[PDB]
Design an enzyme around this catalytic site. Structure first.
Site, mmCIF file in Angstrom:
data_model
loop_
_atom_site.group_PDB
_atom_site.id
_atom_site.type_symbol
_atom_site.label_atom_id
_atom_site.label_comp_id
_atom_site.label_asym_id
_atom_site.label_seq_id
_atom_site.Cartn_x
_atom_site.Cartn_y
_atom_site.Cartn_z
ATOM 1 N N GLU A 294 0.789 -1.251 0.000
ATOM 2 C CA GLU A 294 0.000 0.000 0.000
ATOM 3 C C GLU A 294 0.812 1.289 0.000
ATOM 4 O O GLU A 294 0.563 2.180 0.798
ATOM 5 C CB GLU A 294 -0.976 -0.011 1.181
ATOM 6 C CG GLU A 294 -1.970 -1.163 1.096
ATOM 7 C CD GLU A 294 -2.962 -1.207 2.251
ATOM 8 O OE1 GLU A 294 -2.932 -0.311 3.127
ATOM 9 O OE2 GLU A 294 -3.756 -2.173 2.282
ATOM 10 N N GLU B 7 -5.920 -10.785 -1.490
ATOM 11 C CA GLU B 7 -6.758 -10.630 -0.301
ATOM 12 C C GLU B 7 -8.219 -10.574 -0.670
ATOM 13 O O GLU B 7 -8.960 -9.751 -0.158
ATOM 14 C CB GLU B 7 -6.347 -9.364 0.457
ATOM 15 C CG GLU B 7 -4.850 -9.232 0.655
ATOM 16 C CD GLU B 7 -4.470 -8.002 1.464
ATOM 17 O OE1 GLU B 7 -5.397 -7.342 1.995
ATOM 18 O OE2 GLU B 7 -3.238 -7.703 1.531
#
Ligand SMILES: [Mg+2]
Ligand code: NA
Length: 354
Positions: free
Chosen positions: A149, A259
């Site tokens: 991220e 994910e």
């Protein structure tokens, strides 16, 4: 009443020509009904929390390996692949990383020479952390989330980089050093990923693309992109997901879905149903259709997709519940998987096993 997961066809076997099938896990979920489901269906796992930086080095020189080791031992025992999540993140990362030698936060430093010294100190701390972890787990790990991220959702700077403490202190250097160091210690055959959410939507997708291309041009070793795929039933579209994967494949990179969860709600997740039983069947059918389309796409792109991991096992444990409760006055239940909370199959299971 639907059959238990361990009485239906293995998803890993079903997808063995195309990609791994994985799940995120906690050390307490490797026995009982979850262990049973995991062994039956999955050929890959990842640690939901136990391999994040704070979970491994909570203070300097003090390493806590037991949760991580327990997950590695399970993977080894059952012939599973293993994603490492994650060497670098702006959350679940120890405070001590970002303190100068006097004990004060590096972001507070204004003197230019001390900021440069702080940057060098932080990158050195990053290297030692990466070196130590990689040396321990390199022979078990089949894919690394080297950084997590690091691209922003907006455009705070021209490159769309997240302005976390890492960026504030080092600029983009932390990203370079993380990949260089991982490559260096894990060896040439280690698979190095940059992992992120909303990799399907602009401007984020383009910022990530540009980042990857820049780093590749500088010789930084990146092998793949991790698509978190925290998605909804109607969003993002199948074509947006396809275009993203095709873009990164075009740069010579591997894609992994890392994910995956299919929420029953939008963003923000409201109105949410207050309990699992309150969830109406249409939602599960709509979710089944969605899952069908996703996995047909994944199969279509399997030359450029090596692994697909769900961010959980069955509907009894998902971080999406926290989110639901947060935007619905403390009460809410999401149901993102193909297995229900009692480990019986959902309509979505049939639609991706066929
Ligand atoms: Mg299908
Ligand atoms: Na593949």
């Amino acid at each position: 009443v639907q059959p238990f997961a361990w009485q239906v066809a293995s998803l890993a076997d079903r997808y063995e020509e195309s990609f791994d099938i994985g799940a995120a896990v906690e050390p307490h979920q490797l026995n009982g009904r979850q262990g049973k489901v995991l062994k039956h269906h999955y050929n890959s796992i990842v640690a939901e929390n136990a391999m994040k930086p704070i979970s491994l080095q909570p203070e300097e020189g003090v390493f806590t390996w037991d949760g991580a080791d327990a997950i590695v031992e399970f993977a080894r025992k059952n012939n599973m692949n293993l994603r490492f999540h994650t060497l670098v993140w702006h959350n679940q990362v120890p405070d001590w990383f970002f303190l100068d030698e006097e004990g004060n936060p590096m972001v507070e430093e204004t003197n230019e020479a001390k900021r440069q010294a702080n940057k060098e100190l932080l990158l050195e701390r990053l290297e030692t952390h990466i070196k130590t972890v990689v040396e321990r787990y390199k022979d078990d790990v089949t894919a690394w989330d080297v950084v997590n991220e690091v691209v922003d959702d907006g455009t705070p700077n021209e490159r769309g980089l997240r302005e976390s403490v890492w960026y504030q202190i080092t600029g983009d250097e932390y990203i370079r050093v993380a990949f260089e160091t991982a490559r260096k210690y894990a060896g040439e055959d280690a698979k190095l990923f940059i992992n992120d959410y909303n990799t399907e939507v602009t401007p984020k997708r383009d910022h990530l693309y540009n980042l990857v291309q820049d780093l590749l041009a500088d010789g930084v070793p990146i092998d793949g992109v991790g698509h978190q795929a925290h998605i909804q039933i109607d969003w993002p579209t199948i074509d947006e997901i396809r275009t993203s994967m095709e873009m990164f494949a075009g740069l010579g990179l591997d894609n992994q879905v890392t994910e995956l969860d299919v929420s029953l709600y939008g963003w923000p997740p409201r109105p949410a149903f207050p309990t699992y039983d309150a969830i109406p069947q249409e939602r599960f059918q709509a979710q089944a259709d969605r899952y069908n389309q996703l996995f047909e796409l994944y199969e279509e792109l399997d030359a450029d997709l090596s692994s697909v991991t769900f961010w959980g096992i069955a509907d009894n444990h998902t971080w999406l519940d926290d989110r639901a409760r947060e935007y619905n006055d403390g009460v809410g239940k999401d149901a993102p998987f193909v297995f229900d909370p009692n480990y019986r199959v959902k309509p979505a299971f049939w639609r991706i096993i066929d």
